[PDB]
Assembly symmetry: D2
């Protein structure tokens, strides 16, 4: 991968986020998703890569754009691409917290080619966190005890994040019984997982079941930021098992570590759509100095150098014109 594509990825997530923000709070999940997909595809085809979508909007039969296997880019180094044009379509439609646009790139085969199934996840931040600090087969209590010891705090200081779902009741109960503080997000476990390794997020541990593509994207970010994560694909019927087999996955109970989900040279980029526990959302700003503009907040990182860049971008815009001029 050319060093240039890292910083080019942030332009993609910025344009996707502005498109999504034009649909924020319009109550149309589909329109928000479509605005993001359009902008991200358009932006991607200007990046100097020979890219193949390995995680994206879905299979070609269900997704006309950014489908698994689609070729993207203007030509260049060959890369596998893990996309989320809009992480949080419902989030964005309701103006909720933790909506992001996400783009990750790897050398060929770098990402777990994961099906659209659920995935158990446990994640903690810290560059010094050793392999095995978290393990899905151990109890919540033991994982949290090891994490508290590694961070040098009493159990009661720990903030565990999980999604507000019935499937997480037991997690929430056990964590709380062993003394930790457990906070709940409505949607957005990409942001929720990455927040374990984000400065001043207030979140120490993520534990929960969510989308498998979302789990891989989070693992790419954690590979760059430092931390440990374990994941395990869940299968509820024969159709899901068939998706797995179609993507080359046959060990259905495998526990994946970070290196199994995203390996080698990884670039991760994200932009906030709404305010979240990882990134701030797009905002309209006035000024006589430069006129009105939209502000976006992004992060781009790469696993080889561990360099992390936080980017605040000012995009000229006349808010007397309709906001949907931010689309494509």
């Amino acid at each position: 991968m050319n060093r240039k594509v890292a910083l080019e990825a942030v332009r993609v997530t910025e344009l996707a986020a502005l498109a999504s923000w034009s649909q924020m709070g319009r109550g149309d999940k589909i329109a928000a998703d479509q605005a993001a997909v359009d902008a991200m595809r358009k932006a991607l085809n200007e990046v100097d890569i020979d890219g193949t979508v390995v995680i994206g909007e879905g299979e070609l039969d269900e997704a006309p754009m950014l489908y698994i296997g689609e070729k993207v880019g203007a030509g260049g180094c060959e890369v596998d691409i893990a996309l989320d044009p809009l992480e949080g379509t419902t989030i964005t439609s309701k103006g909720g917290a933790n909506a992001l646009t996400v783009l990750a790139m790897a050398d060929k085969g770098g990402f777990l080619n994961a099906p659209d199934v659920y995935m158990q996840k446990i994640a903690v931040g810290g560059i010094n966190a050793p392999k095995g600090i978290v393990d899905l087969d151990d109890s919540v209590t033991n994982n949290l005890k090891r994490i508290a010891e590694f961070k040098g705090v009493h159990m009661s200081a720990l903030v565990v994040c999980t999604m507000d779902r019935p499937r997480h009741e037991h997690i929430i109960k056990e964590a709380r019984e062993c003394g930790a503080r457990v906070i709940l997000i409505n949607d957005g476990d990409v942001s929720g997982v990455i927040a374990t390794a984000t400065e001043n997020s207030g979140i120490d541990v993520y534990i929960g079941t969510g989308g498998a593509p979302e789990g891989v994207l989070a693992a790419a970010a954690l590979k760059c930021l430092g931390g440990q994560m374990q994941a395990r694909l869940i299968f509820n019927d024969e159709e899901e098992i068939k998706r797995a087999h179609r993507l080359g996955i046959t060990d259905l109970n495998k526990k994946y570590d970070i290196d199994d989900l995203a390996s080698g040279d990884i670039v991760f980029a994200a932009t906030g759509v709404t305010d979240g526990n990882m990134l701030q959302g797009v905002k309209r700003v006035n000024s006589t100095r430069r006129g009105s503009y939209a502000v976006t907040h992004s992060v781009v990182m790469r696993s080889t150098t561990k360099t992390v860049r936080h980017i605040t971008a000012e995009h000229s815009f006349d808010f007397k014109e309709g906001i949907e001029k931010f689309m494509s």
Copy 2:
């Protein structure tokens, strides 16, 4: 009011927030409320005021502490006090957004003496916003057209905030049908209303029905920040109408403007408990330079001077002990 009480009010809201934070994500709404009430009462009794609670936890037969009429303070200038020890008890218990501790002070009779009933609210920020820019008897569409013209933006740029409740469905649809973006909060319409006059909140208008004491608190802050707000009390049974009558209110459909809710010299102080659209919440911080500490984020403001102060406070704490050492 002596100028000193303004800055002493932030110490009160800070201690209340740290006590509340020790209960964040513990799933105990009652214990979070009680930690906040205890810390706020203890800190209030060290403020050099002759204070009378006019907005508080409730009536004495239902609230043992910080009840309507309670005398508080170490002695000094006479003030009416509007309190919210924890705005967002459920929020705090679940670690959701927009939880605050709030303390406002006025000269005697400065706050609307309303019963604890629902209140229709409409609020916009801006020092130059004229009286009448918002009116509860006009349609959502006409209010929003006037706001869009005053702010100099297309209707689609406006971000209207309201709570995610069935009672707001009509508002949601109409705003969206006229072209605006409408974002939903799960709770905390104090922060929701104050966000309209808060820099970089990304919220332009609040329209919703919520608690009347919360409406008064938000109006006090807006009196200091600059903005317009109209309220109308709602009565759902004969006992609530009786409450109004015993307090001297017979015009049940009265539209209160910002000056009717909070008049004269007003001091307003608030500290974040969780991250919200007005203030950031408490965080645990490490440093070799000063050791570990909790950071609080507060605001204090005064209507006479319009001076606004944003306070970031570092409170030393050894997080090897239990977090509940932050309780008073």
Copy 3:
């Protein structure tokens, strides 16, 4: 001291900074100093203390004089004062100009004459007494500081003032491998920077005013760190001042506890941008109109609580700026 006075102090420094700022870059050192003094005295007299100025603008010509009684009535406090640390700074619009107030219980501050003072300072709550000492070599001081901070010598940033009298310090610190950065003026800011987050300054070594050293020590006692100071006597009459104040060990080395002891409150507000605080700025907004923004810090040694205050003060900049004077 009541907890109330801590937060009242910051209002004092903010008002002094706004009045100083009205005179920033006007090339009138005297007018700056007078605007600052007027604002600070008027604000101090509304604070509920029986205050006594023990360190201030020492010559009456330069009205917050040694021994003056200030305050509206309350607990007895000694007041260590600088209405404007950097009169020349503010008048030139140079870096590191501050307004500063420290308070202690009676006798808490060193009673030092208006003489020069050798200083060495480092930040860090865990730094032990003896990490810095004015009789050890610059080299050995820096070796201990590098070890304490866990960095290579070459990473250390030493701050001193750009004066001939610091040539030897500068040479030796660079000889041993450290980076040495120079400030035009403002060794209050320069010393406190050693314990300020993101200042980029690890150590201060230099000679400056004794009052400024006491003020910096008061802040370091709240922020965490170590400092040593020694008074310098060039004239017979400076020695006589010292004798008049009960000092006969002229070569005494003062640790921080000797400079500022007991319960200490320290407050400062930036006038110009510097290595500890940001300076006052003019801001526009449709939302609240125009305002001046001040950046302040207030801290207390007993609790170690530190508050950073960003304050927005309404102002019509179509009117002359000197309406910010008291």
Copy 4:
């Protein structure tokens, strides 16, 4: 110019800034300059451009690297390049304020090919400022009266920045006489001119004489941020006139508008070396999640889009190792 080169320019300025920072406060302006030159040339040759140095380190007879005319880059779109490996070598050697590293790119002929001579400069920020607001032949007083009118402030509110030099005494005296506030910098009139269009700089106007290539670099930035500037080359001896003639300039008293200094599509990038009135300098940071790193603060901007990006970058480093490891 491809959109990718904009964000690639920042990597160049960041690497030059890190290398300069390793020499900060070492009292060796030659060594600081050489570290910056080496790092900038090595980073530039990885940028996908066909570049020609029009403003650089010097003429080939005096500068072996980054000399006027040198071809640089890895190959790509053709660009003229205006370089300052280290703006403020003496600054950086003393750890003084306002040192920057600077890289700007334009379409061919975009920059004034300026000789190494002094240049009178006057500059003001603001997208609405009209050509003629500043003019070197009007008095300081009349320039300042127009700028006060344009900004809507009393003359006493204005802050004029200039360098502390004898040649500027008349400026300083007249500006103070007409009522403005005049703040002085020891060095760094690239930063000082750009500060006029930087948010919260506190600097309204820059007036003074400095390096001509520095004037062109600042003009490039102002063309992206919005502002007006006028410049005039001045000549002290025959050698300096010859420097002008060698570059095709015989109209020695020409006044250059901002469009004469930098025109067309311009990308401008800069990174702080030391804290200054436009950018913060490099800092050493410790973290209990990421380890130690150096933080750089950069900006990159483009005149066609007016997009401005503020970039905070975290560069992994073990500070137990010698700081000279930042020289690449």
